[PDB]
Amino acid sequence: GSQVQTNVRCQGGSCASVCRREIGVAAGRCINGRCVCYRN
């Protein structure tokens, strides 16, 4: 997968704003306890 993995914890909920900070794109998802971010 081309998801961008991060060190930011989550137990559900939005990762969009976290991803704005992490990768500069306000898109992502909580997967298995951490945020991933989407750049296309």
In sequence order, which residues have a C-beta less than 8 Å from that of residue 1 and are 6 or more positions away?
A: none
Domain locations in the chain as residue ranges: 1-40
The rounded distance, in Å, linking the Cα atoms of 40 and 32 is 21
Resolution (angstroms) equals 1.8
Output DSSP code: residue 29. Answer: E
The amino acid that residue 35 corresponds to is C
Question: How does DSSP classify residue 12?
Answer: S
- The sign of the torsion formed by the CA atoms of 2, 5, 10, 14 equals negative
Question: Which residue stretches of 1-40 are H helix?
Answer: 16-23
Closest CA to 38 of 21, 19, 12, 10: 19
Question: CA-CA distance, 24 to 5, in Å (whole number)?
Answer: 13
- Token representation of residue 18: 């976290």
Residues 6+ apart with CB under 8 A from 13: 30
CATH of domain 1-40: 3.30.30.10
